[PDB]
Amino acid sequence: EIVLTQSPGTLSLSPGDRATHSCRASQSVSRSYLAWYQQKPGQTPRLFIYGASNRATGIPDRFSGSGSGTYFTLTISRLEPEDFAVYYCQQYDSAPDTFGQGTRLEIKRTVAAPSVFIFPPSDEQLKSGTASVVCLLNNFYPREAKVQWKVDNALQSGNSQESVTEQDSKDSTYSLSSTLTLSKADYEKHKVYACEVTHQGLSSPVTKSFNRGE
Amino acid sequence: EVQLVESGGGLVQPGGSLRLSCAVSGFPFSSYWMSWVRQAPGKGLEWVANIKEDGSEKYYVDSVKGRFTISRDNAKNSLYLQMNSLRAEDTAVYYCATDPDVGLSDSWGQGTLVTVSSASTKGPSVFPLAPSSKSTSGGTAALGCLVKDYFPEPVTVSWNSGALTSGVHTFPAVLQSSGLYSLSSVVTVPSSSLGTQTYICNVNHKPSNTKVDKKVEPKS
Ligand SMILES: N[C@@H]1[C@@H](O)[C@H](O)[C@@H](CO[C@@H]2O[C@H](CO)[C@@H](O)[C@H](O)[C@H]2N)O[C@H]1O
Numbered sequence: 534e535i536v537l538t539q540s541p542g543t544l545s546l547s548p549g550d551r552a553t554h555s556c557r558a559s560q561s562v563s564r565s566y567l568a569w570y571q572q573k574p575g576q577t578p579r580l581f582i583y584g585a586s587n588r589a590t591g592i593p594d595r596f597s598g599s600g601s602g603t604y605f606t607l608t609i610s611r612l613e614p615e616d617f618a619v620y621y622c623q624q625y626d627s628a629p630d631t632f633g634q635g636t637r638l639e640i641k642r643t644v645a646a647p648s649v650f651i652f653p654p655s656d657e658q659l660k661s662g663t664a665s666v667v668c669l670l671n672n673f674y675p676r677e678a679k680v681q682w683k684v685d686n687a688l689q690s691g692n693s694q695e696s697v698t699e700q701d702s703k704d705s706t707y708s709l710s711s712t713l714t715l716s717k718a719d720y721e722k723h724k725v726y727a728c729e730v731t732h733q734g735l736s737s738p739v740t741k742s743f744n745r746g747e
Numbered sequence: 748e749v750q751l752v753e754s755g756g757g758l759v760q761p762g763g764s765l766r767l768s769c770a771v772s773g774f775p776f777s778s779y780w781m782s783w784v785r786q787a788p789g790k791g792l793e794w795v796a797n798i799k800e801d802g803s804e805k806y807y808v809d810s811v812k813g814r815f816t817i818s819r820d821n822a823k824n825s826l827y828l829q830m831n832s833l834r835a836e837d838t839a840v841y842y843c844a845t846d847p848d849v850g851l852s853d854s855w856g857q858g859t860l861v862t863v864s865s866a867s868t869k870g871p872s873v874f875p876l877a878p879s880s881k882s883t884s885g886g887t888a889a890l891g892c893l894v895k896d897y898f899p900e901p902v903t904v905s906w907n908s909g910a911l912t913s914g915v916h917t918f919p920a921v922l923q924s925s926g927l928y929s930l931s932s933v934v935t936v937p938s939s940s941l942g943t944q945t946y947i948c949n950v951n952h953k954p955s956n957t958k959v960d961k962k963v964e965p966k967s
């Protein structure tokens with residue numbers, strides 16, 4: 534097996550910056566049978582580079598590949614906001630036609646604070662024994678954020694889950710949903726439900742709350 | 748117009764089998780090596796198998812030798828993966844993937860999720876995330892739909908039958924401790940539209956043949 538090792542594992546660069554993605558092989562890859570793919574979250578990979586340096590159909594000039602032997606690169610000469618992805622190299626010289634582990638490229642932008650919104654459980658859901666409380670953080674950067682749920686001012690742990698959207702292809706922000714899940718019995722023993730958000734763009738943390746049943 | 752269309756995936760019992768098909772159009776299929784590549788949830792791409800243009804040479808990852816078989820039908824421009832003795836290690840999105848020498852960006856299929864599990868398809872409950880003063884300022888309101896307790900992936904969510912697209916964020920599903928998935932989809936709209944425009948989320952869970960339309964009504 535030819536092992537392909539990609540570096541860096543993660544890369545964050547701004548529009549206009551030059552991005553370099555490396556692919557090292559454990560033995561020589563002959564015939565420059567080395568490809569690069571772009572994969573966006575939850576989407577089919579697109580072939581970008583084949584034969585080490587050839588652009589695939591529909592690939593813009595800012596993407597280029599180079600290399601031979603054991604060392605290859607994929608360059609984005611001038612980043613555009615639509616260029617975030619995981620980039621994978623693959624050799625197709627000798628089976629198994631192995632992939633590298635990918636480099637996740639994020640598009641850096643200037644700090645952008647989230648808008649925070651809290652949504653009580655719907656009447657319909659409470660009917661059936663469970664309460665989901667949703668806290669939405671909209672359109673922010675960087676991706677790192679801390680959401681703390683408080684119930685009657687007591688810090689919660691273990692009863693929430695979070696999910697984050699892919700980067701916006703035009704303005705490079707993210708959005709995040711946090712869902713607190715309780716039994717209806719537990720839900721009805723408390724009054725104040727609060728989501729407290731800490732983020733680099735907020736000079737001070739922002740708390741959104743409601744009182745149950747109002 | 749290059750298209751690779753996969754079928755044959757979905758939920759399958761551990762120890763069971765699936766037959767994956769891939770119908771190719773838009774380039775000379777019979778000139779190229781073809782492959783299957785898979786991606787386990789949250790993981791990287793993994794090459795599975797490939798086949799020469801005439802079928803006469805094929806290679807496999809060791810973990811599937813003797814239980815997966817790659818074949819092709821050049822007459823029907825189709826690629827196949829017959830998968831047997833399936834295990835949870837096989838759970839992944841499977842892509843048919845042309846030899847990169849073809850040089851076409853759009854040379855992989857859309858992917859089919861294979862979930863190796865003894866759980867049953869189960870359709871979501873859909874609850875509104877109603878707009879209110881808490882989701883509304885600066886002339887815009889946020890609203891949405893909580894799509895809760897379904898298995899397996901995936902679901903699709905649209906708004907107003909696809910008429911509403913701007914300002915939509917449909918979150919990646921989270922797997923709950925229950926072993927069921929949940930997801931929210933949210934949209935930001937003009938607060939002035941709340942009296943006037945109807946907002947409906949259209950949820951399709953193909954694995955359970957469940958379709959739900961939920962109207963999301965404003966709070967005072
Ligand atoms: N073990 C190899 C297999 O896994 C490779 O993908 C394959 C690719 O080389 C191919 O060469 C033919 C002709 O020589 C060319 O038309 C294809 O497009 C190449 N990708 O080689 C096997 O030996």
Ligand SMILES: [Cl-]
Nearest residue numbers: 631632793794
């Ligand atoms: Cl691989």
